[PDB]
Design a protein around this ligand. Sequence first.
Ligand SMILES: [Mg+2]
Ligand SMILES: [Zn+2]
Ligand SMILES: [Zn+2]
Ligand SMILES: [Zn+2]
Lengths: 49, 400, 44, 64, 57, 34, 257, 117, 330
Amino acid sequence: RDGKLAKPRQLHNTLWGMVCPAETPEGHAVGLVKNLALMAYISVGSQPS
Amino acid sequence: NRQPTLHKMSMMGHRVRILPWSTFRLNLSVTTPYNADFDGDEMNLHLPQSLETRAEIQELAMVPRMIVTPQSNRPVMGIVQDTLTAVRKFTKRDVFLERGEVMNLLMFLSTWDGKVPQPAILKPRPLWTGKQIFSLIIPGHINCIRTHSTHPDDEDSGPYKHISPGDTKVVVENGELIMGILCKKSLGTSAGSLVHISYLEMGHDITRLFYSNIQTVINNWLLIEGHTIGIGDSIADSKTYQDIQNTIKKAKQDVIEVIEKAHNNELEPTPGNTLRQTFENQVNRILNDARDKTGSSAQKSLSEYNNFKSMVVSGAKGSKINISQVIAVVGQQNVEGKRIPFGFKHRTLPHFIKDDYGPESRGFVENSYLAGLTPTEFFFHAMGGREGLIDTAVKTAETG
Amino acid sequence: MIYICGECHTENEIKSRDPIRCRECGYRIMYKKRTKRLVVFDAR
Amino acid sequence: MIIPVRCFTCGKIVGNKWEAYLGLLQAEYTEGDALDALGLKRYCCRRMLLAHVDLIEKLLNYAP
Amino acid sequence: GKEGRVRGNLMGKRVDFSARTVITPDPNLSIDQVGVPRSIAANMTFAEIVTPFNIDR
Amino acid sequence: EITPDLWQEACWIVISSYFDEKGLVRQQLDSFDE
Amino acid sequence: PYANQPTVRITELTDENVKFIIENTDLAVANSIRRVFIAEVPIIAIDWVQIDANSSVLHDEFIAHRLGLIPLTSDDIVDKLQYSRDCTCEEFCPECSVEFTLDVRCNEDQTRHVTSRDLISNSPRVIPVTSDDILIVKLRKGQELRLRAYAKKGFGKEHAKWNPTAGVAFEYDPDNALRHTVYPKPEEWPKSEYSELDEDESQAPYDPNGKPERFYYNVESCGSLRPETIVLSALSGLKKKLSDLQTQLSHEIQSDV
Amino acid sequence: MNAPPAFESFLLFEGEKKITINKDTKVPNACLFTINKEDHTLGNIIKSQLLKDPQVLFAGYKVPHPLEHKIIIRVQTTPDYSPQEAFTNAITDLISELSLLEERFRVAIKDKQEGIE
Amino acid sequence: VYITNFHVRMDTLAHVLYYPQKPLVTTRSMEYLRFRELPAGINSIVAIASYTGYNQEDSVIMNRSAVDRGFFRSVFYRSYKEQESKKGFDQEEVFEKPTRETCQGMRHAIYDKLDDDGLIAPGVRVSGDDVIIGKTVTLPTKRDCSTFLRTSETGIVDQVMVTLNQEGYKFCKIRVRSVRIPQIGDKFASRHGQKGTCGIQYRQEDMPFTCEGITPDIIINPHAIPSRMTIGHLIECLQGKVSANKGEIGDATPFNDAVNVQKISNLLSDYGYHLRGNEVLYNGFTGRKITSQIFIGPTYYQRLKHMVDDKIHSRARGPIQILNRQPMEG
Ligand SMILES: [Mg+2]
Ligand SMILES: [Zn+2]
Ligand SMILES: [Zn+2]
Ligand SMILES: [Zn+2]
């Protein structure tokens, strides 16, 4: 929560449509917690049989 | 004092005055030293208990004794956000006041001797001027020569050097405003200003009255003159829009010729430059010099009644690029000091085709904040804002 | 004093140092009855 | 939760116009015409009814 | 060290006779004045020695 | 049979079908039942 | 060095608004009586509530607040009532108060609206404005409400429940004959209701030796006082302020010796 | 309770006096009245009347703080006139103006008891 | 309003607005997250002008005689727990009314509000430093404890509950109700990132009015716009003025491309207004016209949680610690 490395904090191209681009807190936790978009759906899993 | 104490101006000695409700109340020209603003801020006060400590706080660290700073030998308190815009309009060449309004304004001068000056226009009816009333606020007999922020540099060359059709070249001779409009270059916190000279010559107990009188008189005139900002002040005529469209089209044209002549290996690298480097350098040239003339085309179409130009010219708040960003073009975004990278593989978003190097496909936002942005431009704008938001979070801890 | 059940709202006087249960309902959440000394407000 | 008795800006009495407003929207009226049939002509008094959410009808579902 | 007895209570310590609250603007005050509510002013004190010049007051 | 320029009211009628069934916290409720 | 001869002329008259015109006066006087229609006209309103049993949905201080903003008929008996701080009685007496009473209980299953038809008073001169009905609260089967309230006298500087008027329009100089306001593009502005210009003009020609006259008013009413006794009680109230200040003044420069 | 009650804005206390005179010592024939528990409603009505007197050189008023209730009025007259004279002559001219306008109004409302048209 | 059954839940620190309203300019993706059935805000009439200097540097002037009609009024609940416990044979606790001569460790505060049980009946007006729960510990006679309020509450006891926790330890919960009227420290914010405190409150007889008597509820500084460029704030107050006059509710979906400014302005000049929102305001103190025209219209403001009644505190020779004799809290 205090590391100064920017690459885990900057906005990545692959977040299009799956994580909200504008909503994030300021302070020391910038870009570390994120909220997911409206229609984004997380999978639950199945068997490859 | 305020939350972080950086320099010795972040802790100064005030004087108590008790009021009904339950917040600390303080003047505005002192918010520059404390670096404060009134959106849920907080400040502490400590009360000297002895009498020796009271005397030393009184003769060492009272706020009128700390107007000029030893860090850069220039004042730290100047006229501020709302009084500056009004002071610029109050000292224009054409501001005439009737009798009742002059009396009402003189009622607010704390250092007035009790005499009413003779009007500048005795017939057909008596009318006072803005500079004629401002000449009563200026203390003692001081002397100063400054310039206004719109002084054409080619004015000292020809004739009218001491006439100044635009009413520039502020001249304060023997303690009275003879000519010129007042702005941040002549009343703010810079070396050689009017407040600096008044502090150097008259002392530390008269500059206090100077500040207070300026503020009270100008506010009580502003509630007659009024001030605002709308969307009529954020829109342009039909001719300017066509010009902006034309120049944008021609720039997007030139970029295409550069690209398609780089695809036939017809580019020659410059000394110390890779081929990618020279390609992107000249496309950045084309894109950057393009938005500038759109900015100038937006500027030269503004009006004298515009309210953006009224806060930019007086130096109260804003810059000359926000005008062009609101009216003409947002410009070109970039992360890490370079163009928008290929976050996907050979793409920026799944809406483009691979290895597209055009302007719109790598961050050039060609709309204005009034016409709104398209989704792909919204995203790139968010990226630029995010990096600009992280840097500030780092800076505070580092410097402290 | 006098308590009010949380389900059937049937008042029942509970004596000091006595288990907390309703009657006719068998319930274990009791609300104390509103006071009888009067307080005055302003329409302001 | 319940319609205010007075417009916040003018002071005109609004609290007696909520049932008549629902009654006009009931038949066929548009919101623009129902507000004119009641005599609300300043746009500060029309905001009162046009943007009101009636939460009192959902707190009457919990048994006392 | 910090928060021990050498770096947490020798030079940096909590003090009395102090208050804290929000700030709001006031253009009617001189640049050397501050406005204090009546609940803070009726709490902090100042010891004043008695001399035959200020006995009655 | 095609949808020409009636699109602005058509896209908001499939999105209504999505939220009427799924909801907003199906994220949490489905990993627990598993 | 003396006063003027203003002349009034009424245009409309209803039971809820008056339109008139005051010619030949000064701007400061035409405004000082615009602030008196609002602030300093006395009126009756509830100012003391005591609740005996409230089992409704809204808490006690919600209902005590929706009661004070109910307008009571203050037509004629406002001049006979003392201020409760001046009267020589105890906390309350029928010389400086009016007592109300509400008591409602819901027994049927269908919901019940507690309107203002339930405020029952003792003096038949001051009743809520019913001669629809303002809603106070809704009750469910098994809930009740009962209270007692007194209604004092005051004006609009105390609290905004004592002012007798809705919006008070006011304007002068319908065309910029004086250029008090400066239009950047005088063509985009709608023409005023009181204007006398042609359909293809924007402003009257500027005249420098002018002065504002012929002010236009429009005073509405909330329901307590008639719209024509709001004005008569304002002029008779402003006159009595200056007339009392002249007493204190002559009492000062007389005790100067 | 850190908020003042509403009646403090117009109701006089026991020790206070509504009006107070002081003579200005910087210029001759100047005075400075300090009305207490008052505001712009009364302050502005006076100043406009004094300017209509051809024997008054100065006239103005200010509310020194919007959160306290007190105004100040300054007057200066020609050497053959008194500030206390010009002040009281102004008031009796307002009263002669309001009482006149009330008569002309009460006539206009009963000018349409049934209606003129 | 955060949930419909807020009457049952004895949460700690619950805020509730009196009169919530739904927006007049809505996005189409708010019907799916229930923002028109549990809204948080009120449509206020905002004017962007410099009036008397009390709204400089992110502040707002607000109408005082609109606060008196319910504007942005709210309530504030808070709960307290107490649990009687047998941590020892003689060290047993019990709810009872401590008497002066038997118990010993009490303060001199009043114990008359307590009932025989040791709890306060709902309805009384409990002020700062007023004991609410009387709990006595038996000494190996009777050494009493108790719970006192914090300072400066001035609440009213809402309701008292008595029951048994996870195990067999009797415990009670008490909720205190307190009403909060907006005053000149409170924090207000728009829907576009413009927070700001309240600077001063003027009555209706002092605010500037239009040519038909419409005074603004809030006045904000024009300098807040040009530096941060929130032009979405200047269109929803233009769009909002058309929605109140026509009777619809506007649409502000982001990427619509069917709602220009030229299409909103041409809709506004049909109802007899200037086609950019500007209006001619009169000064409230002197009745004179204002030389400029002021941009006025309805917008949707929210009331943030940071109030000033909670952030003021002072110390002057207070209690000190025991080991190091350094100033301590209480
Ligand atoms: Mg800040
Ligand atoms: Zn039961
Ligand atoms: Zn209204
Ligand atoms: Zn009585």
